[PDB]
Nucleic acid binder design. Sequence first.
RNA 1: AUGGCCGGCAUGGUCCCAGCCUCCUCGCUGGCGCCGGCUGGGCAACACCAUUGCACUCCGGUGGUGAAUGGGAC
Length: 95
Amino acid sequence: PETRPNHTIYINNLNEKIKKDELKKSLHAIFSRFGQILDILVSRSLKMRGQAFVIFKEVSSATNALRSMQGFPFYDKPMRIQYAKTDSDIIAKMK
RNA sequence: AUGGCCGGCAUGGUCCCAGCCUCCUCGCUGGCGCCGGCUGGGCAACACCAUUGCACUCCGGUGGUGAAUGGGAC
Ligand SMILES: [Sr+2]
Ligand SMILES: [Sr+2]
């Protein structure tokens, strides 16, 4: 099943050995160029490890980010990027 | 002494220097002889195992101390 365009991109296949704080910092280092980021959500729990949500202010940023960085080698692993299924809370609280 | 508790045995002492050791006051006002048994805390770090997982509620499991020695002064 495919996903529809979204403010938020969902990244998985991330290196699970990286600490939350550093992972957010690094993700920002490479994704900020695509547009203003509202937040980056990372959790190292059993269910949510290896994954991240990057919440852009504009959908065009998310879209550009998804196209350009698909398969990007990151901590020695190719990034897999999709649109999030649903809107992040940060986004609902505006639009 | 050890995260806490006990037993067998060995071993002259107090300082100074260097090297090493550790999940549980990484520190020079901790520790670094032999062997056996009992037991608590915690995944914070570290390691291993499992996990490819769509969140906006912090939240998988297991492991270790079964550790580390030389030199000088009195
Ligand atoms: Sr110790
Ligand atoms: Sr853990």
